[PDB]
Every structure is written in structure tokens, then in C-alpha cells.
DNA sequence: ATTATGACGCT
DNA sequence: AGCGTCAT
């Protein structure tokens, strides 16, 4: 009763840039705006691999991880933008710089954790407190939430339903209690409307967002109403929301662990987990996962929003699938050199922008026929931002994988250079 | 031949 | 340190 903490102490948002690479290409080329369009990488093998898809194109069944030649069967008027190719590989600089534009605007409002190029977590707890003191008991108008869904409402025209749900929520609100978690989430949602408006004004980019009390619920909420909308998931909404939520939809349970939760416990939905004791869950899935699951199925998660706006690693990777696998010494050296030259460019720009230096180089390879995605991962010291030295060291570090008697065997199907372990400079 | 990145845990 | 998991 009075002593079960309910995980309502924070306001946390997850912001996800809608089909981000597509938006970047649509800003640059207005002929692509408001059309079915996708971004591809490469073009020879079956038209290229699609990696991002506008919502217009999604309506035709176009998806990521689809060959462009196949997407054209589903959507013959599909428009395509190609990722830049530099030194023989895909070069994602345009999207990294667009992402920095958006992240810098987000950081004006609250502290953000860069989860990936197109999504960030937002710690709004302090921001909401400041805003609540500014209001001085003044009620929150629907006009302040023009794109917000309240999950679970209305109970008892899509825009019409959104507005009905929002009215029901706002009528119920107790504005005089500056400590009600539901009020705190509502003000969080107001601030996120303002943040998203600023992003769109100042970049042209639209995004979706979730607002809740922790990162996992914010991430789940964000996906409920897309594109260009935001969703508030209150603590009270969790029992019904989880009662028909497939376990795989919760962040970190879409993989082998979620599959084993489903198979070992014989359940399907997140809410069914509430029936098990914390000890039972730990006994099946380990102490950490078990405690996490016990709290998570009750809407409770404690992972903090880490104050981290910059990537922790700077990486360069290329697959060489099928008969493109690298089979000679000269091939491996030339591609290590291309990877190392892009790595050097990005590292020098990073050092000048962000006052830090990487100190460790990680080299990862895949060999043909090897079941694993990484056949080997080894580290060496990263002392100077010099492409020839980095590629020479990466070779020096992988060279004893070659089993020939100038040839390379087994041929390599992936090269990967990652700069890690940053230190202030 | 479901990229090229990124995040993180286990031991 | 090297390997495995999860996500888009």
C-alpha cells in the first residue's frame, strides 16, 4: 500500500525522428516531399537495399531491409534517394549532421541522451517543475496539446477521437496539486509539443514522441501514434495497455530473451508477467533481468536518462557479401585504407567540434562461411589520427587470420574500424 | 546478398 | 579484453 513505490518520480520522453533519412532527402529535394519515397544504399544488386521509408510509401507495404526492385513491385511510383558513396562505401555524413541540428535544438529544453542517430531520450523532470511553478495553478488548455494522444482515452474521425480523449483527460485533471504524477506528465507533454514545434520550425523535420515516467514506457508510447504525433502513457494506463501487449514490443524483449520469457512461462502479453514473484523471474532469467521484469510489467523502470548528446564511438563498416568477399592481401589492405580514411576525416572533425580524442581502435572482421557476425574483434592503441597508420595497425592485428601459403583465405565478408574510449582534449 | 551503424551486458 | 544481444 503506502510503501510500494510506483516509479512516478520522473518525467521522461522518447523523441524519434520520423523516417529520418527520408526527411533529410525531402528537405534537400522538394520534389520528394509528401510522396511515397525511400532511401536506398547502393544500386546494382536488385536496385539497392532500402533503409528508410516515408509513411506514404509504408502504406504500399514498402519496408526497410527490402530490395528496391521489390519495393517497386509494391509501389511503382515510389521515389528513391541514394545514400552518398565515398571511397567505395556508403557515407552517412549528411544524416549525422542533420541529427546534430536536431539534438542541439532538443538540448535547449531538457537534458537529452542520444540513443541513436534518429532518437533521443529527454529528462523533463526539472523542466516540468519549473513550468509548474510558472503556471501558478492555471489550468492546462487543450490548445497547448494540439498533437497529443492520451493512451487509453476516450473510454465509456481520427482527430475527433484524439480530441475526445484529450478533453476527458484534461477535465479529470487536478491542477492544484503540484505533485500529482498525471499533472507532471501533462506538463511534460506541453513542453514536448513546444520542443517538437521548435525542431520543425528550425529544421523542417517532424518527429513523434512518447511521454511517460521512464524510458521504456516513453519508447513504447512513442510508437502508438505515428507519424508527427505524441502519446502520453500515464501510470494508470499501464494495466490495460499491457493486458494485450505482446512481450516482444517492450524495448529489450524483441529478441532471444523475450522469446524465452514467452516459452518458459507460457504467456503472450506483458501484463501476464505480474502473476510471478520477483524470485521466480530471477530464477528463470537471472537476478538482473528478473528484477527488471518484475518492475517493468508494473510500469516501473529505473534506468536513468544519461546526459550524453554525443556518440560514444565513431565507426566505419562495410560488408562484402556473396562473391564480393575479399580474397587477396591487396584487397584487404585497400579496403582497410578506405575505411581508415573515412575514420580519420570523421575523427578530426570530431576532435575540433567536441574537444576529445579517441584512444582505442577496435577492428572487427567476418570471414566467409563463419556463422557469427563478428569472426574476430581485436583492439589496438589509437595514438594519432592518421589513416595509413590505422589501416596498417588493423592489418597487423588481423593478419594471422589468413590461412593461405598474397591470397586471403577464408575470404572476408565484413571489415569494421571503430574509434572508442574518448578522453577530453 | 535483412546496411551501417550505434547502444550495452557477460565473463 | 573478446564475445554476445538488441535495435533501426
Spatial distance between the Cα atoms of A323 and A22, rounded to a whole number of angstroms:
30
Strand C lies under 7 A from the Cβ of residue A64: yes
Asked if A160 and A148 count as a contact pair (C-beta separation under 8 A), the reply is: no
Q: How far is the CA of A259 from the C1' of C4 (A)?
A: 16
Nearest nt (C1') to A248 (CA)?
A: C6
Q: What angle do CA A141, A142, A143 make, to 5 degrees?
A: 85
Strand C lies under 7 A from the Cβ of residue A258: yes
Cell digits of residue A177: 496539486
Spatial distance between the Cα atoms of A111 and A44, rounded to a whole number of angstroms:
43
**SS3 state of residue A380:** strand
Query: Which is nearest to A316 in space by CA: A335, A343, A280?
Result: A343
Burial of A354 per CB tally in 10 Å (0-12, 13-18, 19+): middle
Please state whether beta strands A230-232 and A207-212 pair in parallel, antiparallel, or not at all (unpaired).
parallel
Which sign does the torsion angle of CA A203, A10, A166, A216 carry?
A: positive
Q: What angle do CA A32, A37, A38 make, to 5 degrees?
A: 125
Spatial distance between the Cα atoms of A413 and A327, rounded to a whole number of angstroms:
10
H helices of A55-138, where? 55-58, 68-74, 93-109, 125-135
Asked if A26 and A203 count as a contact pair (C-beta separation under 8 A), the reply is: no
Burial of A31 per CB tally in 10 Å (0-12, 13-18, 19+): exposed
Spatial distance between the Cα atoms of A387 and A390, rounded to a whole number of angstroms:
5
Q: How far is the CA of A150 from the C1' of B4 (A)?
A: 36
Say which residues have a Cβ less than 8 Å from residue A346's Cβ, sequence separation at least 6: A93, A314, A316
Say which residues have a Cβ less than 8 Å from residue A15's Cβ, sequence separation at least 6: A106, A119, A120, A121, A122, A192, A195, A196, A207, A208, A209, A222
Strand C lies under 7 A from the Cβ of residue A288: no
Asked if A394 and A361 count as a contact pair (C-beta separation under 8 A), the reply is: yes
Asked if A12 and A221 count as a contact pair (C-beta separation under 8 A), the reply is: no
Closest residue to B5 by CA to C1' distance? A315
Q: How far is the CA of A367 from the C1' of B11 (A)?
A: 25
Asked if A206 and A18 count as a contact pair (C-beta separation under 8 A), the reply is: yes
Task: Tell me: is residue A119 an annotated ligand-binding position.
Answer: yes
Task: Tell me: is residue A296 an annotated ligand-binding position.
Answer: no
Place of cell 536506398: A40
Asked if A273 and A297 count as a contact pair (C-beta separation under 8 A), the reply is: yes
Q: How far is the CA of A32 from the C1' of C1 (A)?
A: 47
Query: Which is nearest to A76 in space by CA: A47, A100, A33?
Result: A47
Nearest nt (C1') to A255 (CA)?
A: C6
Cis status, amide bond into A410, omega within 30 of 0: yes
* Cα A87 from chain centroid (whole Å): 27
Chain breaks after residues in chain A, where C lies over 2.5 Å from next N: 156, 405
* Cα A234 from chain centroid (whole Å): 22
Cell digits of residue A175: 491542477
Query: Which is nearest to A278 in space by CA: A293, A263, A267, A266?
Result: A293
Q: How far is the CA of A175 from the C1' of B6 (A)?
A: 41
Query: Which is nearest to A386 in space by CA: A351, A425, A412?
Result: A351
Nearest nt (C1') to A96 (CA)?
A: B5
Domains of chain A (ranges plus CATH)? 12-18+95-239 (3.30.70.270), 20-94 (3.40.1170.60), 314-424 (3.30.1490.100)
Place of cell 476527458: A168
Strand C lies under 7 A from the Cβ of residue A378: yes
Task: Tell me: is residue A195 an annotated ligand-binding position.
Answer: no
Closest residue to B4 by CA to C1' distance? A317
Place of cell 480530441: A163
A15, A30, A357, A416 from A364: Cα distances, Å: 31, 39, 21, 5
Query: Which is nearest to A20 in space by CA: A86, A78, A92?
Result: A92
Asked if A238 and A217 count as a contact pair (C-beta separation under 8 A), the reply is: yes
Q: Which residues touch strand B (CB under 7 A)?
A: A 41-42, 44-45, 49, 51, 64-65, 89-90, 92, 96, 114-117, 286, 288-289, 306, 308, 311-319, 321-324, 342, 414, 416, 418
A180, A314, A318, A379, A422 from A418: Cα distances, Å: 46, 6, 12, 9, 12
Buried b (16+ CB within 10 A) or exposed e, A100-120: eebbebbeebbbbbbbebbbb
Nearest nt (C1') to A113 (CA)?
A: B7
The DSSP line for A264-315 is HHT--BGGGGGGS-HHHHHHHH-HHHHHHHHHHTTT--------B-S-S-EE
Burial of A157 per CB tally in 10 Å (0-12, 13-18, 19+): exposed
Spatial distance between the Cα atoms of A68 and A49, rounded to a whole number of angstroms:
6
Asked if A53 and A85 count as a contact pair (C-beta separation under 8 A), the reply is: no
Place of cell 572482421: A365
Query: Which is nearest to A16 in space by CA: A147, A132, A117?
Result: A117
Say which residues have a Cβ less than 8 Å from residue A219's Cβ, sequence separation at least 6: A14, A210, A251
* Cα A111 from chain centroid (whole Å): 17
Strand C lies under 7 A from the Cβ of residue A116: yes
Cell digits of residue A299: 510500469
Q: Which nucleotides of C are covered by protein (CB under 7 A)?
A: 1-8
Calculate the dihedral angle through the C-alpha atoms of A124, A129, A131, A136, rounding to the nearest 10 degrees. 160
Task: Tell me: is residue A390 an annotated ligand-binding position.
Answer: no
Task: Tell me: is residue A118 an annotated ligand-binding position.
Answer: yes
Residues paired with residue A357 on neighbouring β-strands, in sequence order: A423
Amino acid at each position: 500500500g503506502p510503501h510500494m513505490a510506483t516509479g512516478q518520480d520522473r518525467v521522461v520522453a522518447l523523441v524519434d525522428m520520423d523516417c529520418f533519412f527520408v526527411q533529410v532527402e525531402q528537405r534537400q529535394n522538394p520534389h520528394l516531399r509528401n510522396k511515397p519515397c525511400a532511401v536506398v544504399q547502393y544500386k546494382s544488386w536488385k536496385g539497392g537495399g532500402i533503409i528508410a521509408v516515408s509513411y506514404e510509401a509504408r502504406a504500399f507495404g514498402v519496408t526497410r531491409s527490402m530490395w528496391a526492385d521489390d519495393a517497386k513491385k509494391l509501389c511503382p511510383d515510389l521515389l528513391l534517394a541514394q545514400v552518398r558513396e565515398s571511397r567505395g562505401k556508403a557515407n552517412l555524413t549528411k544524416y549525422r549532421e542533420a541529427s546534430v541540428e536536431v539534438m542541439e535544438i532538443m538540448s535547449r529544453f531538457a537534458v537529452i541522451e542520444r540513443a541513436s542517430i534518429d532518437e533521443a531520450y529527454v529528462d523533463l523532470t526539472s523542466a516540468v517543475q519549473e513550468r509548474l511553478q510558472k503556471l501558478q495553478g492555471q489550468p492546462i488548455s487543450a490548445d497547448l496539446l494540439p498533437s497529443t494522444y492520451i493512451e487509453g482515452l476516450p473510454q465509456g474521425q481520427k482527430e475527433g477521437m484524439r480530441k475526445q480523449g484529450l478533453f476527458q483527460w484534461l477535465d479529470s485533471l487536478q491542477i492544484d496539486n503540484l505533485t500529482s504524477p498525471d499533472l507532471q506528465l501533462t506538463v511534460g507533454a506541453v513542453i514536448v509539443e513546444e520542443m517538437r514545434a521548435a525542431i520543425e520550425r528550425e529544421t523542417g523535420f517532424q518527429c513523434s514522441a512518447g511521454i511517460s515516467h521512464n524510458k521504456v514506457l516513453a519508447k513504447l508510447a512513442c510508437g502508438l501514434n505515428k507519424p508527427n504525433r505524441q502519446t502520453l502513457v500515464s501510470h494508470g494506463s499501464v494495466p490495460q495497455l499491457f493486458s494485450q501487449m505482446p512481450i516482444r514490443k517492450i524495448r529489450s524483449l524483441g529478441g532471444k530473451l523475450g522469446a524465452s520469457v514467452i516459452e518458459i512461462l507460457g504467456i503472450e502479453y506483458m501484463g501476464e508477467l505480474t502473476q510471478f514473484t520477483e524470485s521466480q523471474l530471477q530464477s528463470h532469467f537471472g537476478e538482473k533481468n528478473g528484477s527488471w521484469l518484475y518492475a517493468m510489467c508494473r510500469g516501473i523502470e529505473h534506468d536513468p536518462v544519461k546526459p550524453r548528446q554525443l556518440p560514444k564511438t565513431i565507426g566505419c563498416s562495410k560488408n562484402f557479401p556473396g562473391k564480393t568477399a575479399l580474397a587477396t592481401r591487396e584487397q584487404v589492405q585497400w579496403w582497410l585504407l578506405q575505411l581508415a580514411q573515412e575514420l580519420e576525416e570523421r575523427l578530426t572533425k570530431d576532435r575540433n567540434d567536441n574537444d576529445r580524442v579517441a584512444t582505442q581502435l577496435v577492428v572487427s572482421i567476418r570471414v566467409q562461411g563463419d556463422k557469427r557476425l563478428s569472426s574476430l574483434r581485436r583492439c589496438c592503441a589509437l595514438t594519432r589520427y592518421d589513416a595509413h597508420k590505422m589501416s596498417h595497425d588493423a592489418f597487423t592485428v588481423i593478419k594471422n587470420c589468413n590461412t593461405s601459403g598474397t591470397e586471403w583465405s577464408p575470404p572476408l565478408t565484413m571489415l569494421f574500424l571503430c574509434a572508442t574510449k574518448f578522453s577530453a582534449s
